[PDB]
Amino acid sequence: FELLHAPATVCGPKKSTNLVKNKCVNFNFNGLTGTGVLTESNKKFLPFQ
């Protein structure tokens, strides 16, 4: 094993849950976090955003 300053390219299994829309919930997407009511959108992101 070695870790360093750790510009990592390998990790083990990452967790997940079902998607709980329309409730106040404590959330993590891709490692970005907050608390809120998640809900469906008319907004049109670009494919990389």
Partner: peptide, 28 residues
């Protein structure tokens, strides 16, 4: 606007480059 295509974790200290052959170049 230019949009991201490729994003490579590789850790190198780049200081030179070359083309594999009109074609321009400008430094950020």
């Amino acid at each position: 606007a230019l949009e991201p295509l490729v994003d490579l974790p590789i850790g190198i200290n780049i200081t030179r480059f070359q083309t594999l052959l009109a074609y321009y170049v400008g430094y950020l």
